[PDB]
Ligand binder design. Structure first.
Ligand SMILES: CC(C)=CCC/C(C)=C/CSP(=O)(O)OP(=O)(O)O
Ligand SMILES: CC(C)=CCC/C(C)=C/CSP(=O)(O)OP(=O)(O)O
Ligand SMILES: CC(C)=CCC/C(C)=C/CSP(=O)(O)OP(=O)(O)O
Ligand SMILES: CC(C)=CCC/C(C)=C/CSP(=O)(O)OP(=O)(O)O
Ligand SMILES: [Mg+2]
Ligand SMILES: [Mg+2]
Ligand SMILES: [Mg+2]
Ligand SMILES: [Mg+2]
Ligand SMILES: [Mg+2]
Ligand SMILES: [Mg+2]
Lengths: 274, 274
């Protein structure tokens, strides 16, 4: 039944994201469950590309499942698809950003170099802003057009934050999301990055991206009054909690070659939102 | 004196390249010493970018030295510059490919993705074909125009060979020279490459590049009669010796994630050339 299939998706979000489970547990019942289902879609697709043994074939098999899903002919016992089917039934979810999300996951299948900041935003749009777009009909039922730009920019904001915390982790998987033009601008070589060096040039480049993330966070938060009241604390809380990763890395002297917002800090952000 | 400064450059080539020291020891005295000096220039610049701690600044300091060298005002005790200065005095060396070589070394300073085969040839031209061009006035004094295309293609041939043997070694330094379009064409993912997988798709892609190298080797060898007699065995020998790396990897079942032409095989190639 629906409660079991949603409970499965609740287990996924609570296992993989402390920040987003605590934010979204504050939504009303049916919005919260739909976000759980939307989350499990995103998290499966990202796990295929980033952690599956055969990512080209697994993701293509995942997208075919979604084509069948969207045509209402996917018949299965998989709780995530049963939860998503109700969510799509219960709220006017748009499939466009769901597809766009898969197009973004495709980008991580083969070697790519981010050259410019726009390259970076293009990537961030497809793997993170799309998720913002998937959620808006649940979060802002009648006001999607009024809040869409801020949702997109909140996407940029959090993906850059995640990239900025995961520099070493991404290097060890032979991924670089730092724009090459910035590395040239600040004199931070690939040899420097290979030697996991935190010098003044690295900090300059990190801070330049971090301030971009911060402007986007600010834009997104400026749209929070346009959300319905029940969405303001979960959306605002999730943003501030994730934004707090940046300052965490600052207080740890930018050591991103070995970072969590603390549980207590997370609660402080929530309480301030309340 | 000159004999000491050339003897220093002889020590460099014999330490770093079995293939090219044995080929070029067969040249007459003054051609052989000049090749030694030309070799030490190339090998210093490549060592800066690939093994220096501060490659942006070291290579720029190396290029400034060469600007001063070319204006005849570099005064030093460094044997490699004293050997190169005679070589430039003794033979009509062109500085154009020497500069182009540094432009090619610049490319390895920051993250880059080879997208297409032309990307690859562009890179190979600047780091390997230029070396062919540096050598031609010593190897083919009056016939540079007649043999230049083959020298360039011999460049392509050997750089691809080197890339093709060094796939794992280059991966561990966070370098990928495989064109991304080929990985897409043959279904060889970045995850596959990260898992150092030698599957049928990897072999298909490897063999496609290997046949390109082989066509270029064939073109270059077809120009060998246009070289003067004393250059035919060293140029032909060096090419066949380096080309033999490809078949070596074939006989080792393409295991390039852990390959040498044997000493005895090297001698067989030389004797056949003689
Ligand atoms: C679906 C919602 C609301 C949030 C999660 C979206 C999702 C699946 C993010 C993948 S997070 P993660 O693997 O930590 O980040 P990346 O390295 O893939 O860029
Ligand atoms: C919540 C709203 C309004 C927009 C969300 C934008 C968003 C959730 C981008 C992905 S955050 P990510 O770090 O990728 O996912 P987790 O580490 O929390 O698992
Ligand atoms: C100067 C002559 C005739 C041959 C040597 C040219 C030279 C310095 C090649 C560098 S070889 P190597 O480091 O093994 O090859 P790459 O990985 O740099 O592409
Ligand atoms: C000898 C002629 C005519 C053209 C030479 C083209 C050439 C030497 C390209 C570099 S071979 P490389 O593998 O880079 O250098 P080593 O491993 O032998 O040190
Ligand atoms: Mg991902
Ligand atoms: Mg990921
Ligand atoms: Mg990450
Ligand atoms: Mg090199
Ligand atoms: Mg090298
Ligand atoms: Mg190599």
């Amino acid at each position: 039944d629906l409660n079991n299939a949603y409970d499965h998706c609740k287990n996924i979000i609570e296992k993989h994201s402390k920040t987003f489970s605590k934010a979204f547990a504050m939504l009303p019942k049916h919005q919260k469950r739909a976000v759980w289902a939307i989350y499990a879609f995103c998290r499966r697709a990202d796990d295929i590309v980033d952690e599956g043994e055969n990512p080209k074939e697994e993701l293509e098999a995942f997208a075919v499942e979604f084509d069948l899903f969207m045509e209402g002919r996917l018949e299965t016992e998989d709780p995530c698809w049963i939860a998503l089917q109700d969510a799509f039934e219960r709220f006017p979810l748009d499939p466009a950003p769901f597809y766009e999300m898969i197009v973004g996951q495709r980008m991580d299948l083969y070697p790519k170099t981010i050259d410019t900041k726009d390259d970076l935003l293009h990537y961030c749009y497809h793997v993170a802003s799309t998720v913002g777009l998937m959620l808006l009909p649940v979060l802002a039922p009648g006001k999607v057009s009024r809040v869409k730009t801020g949702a997109i920019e909140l996407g940029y904001a959090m993906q850059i934050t995640n990239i900025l915390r995961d520099i070493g982790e991404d290097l060890d998987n032979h991924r670089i999301y730092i724009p090459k033009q910035m590395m040239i601008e600040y004199g931070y070589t690939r040899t420097d990055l290979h030697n996991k060096k935190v010098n003044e040039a690295f900090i300059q480049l990190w801070e330049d991206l971090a301030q971009d993330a911060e402007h986007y966070y600010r834009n997104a938060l400026a749209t929070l009054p346009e959300y319905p009241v029940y969405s303001r604390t979960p959306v605002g809380g999730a943003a501030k909690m994730y934004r707090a990763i940046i300052q965490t890395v600052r207080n740890n002297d930018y050591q991103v070659f070995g970072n969590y917002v603390s549980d207590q800090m997370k609660k402080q952000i929530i309480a301030e939102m309340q």
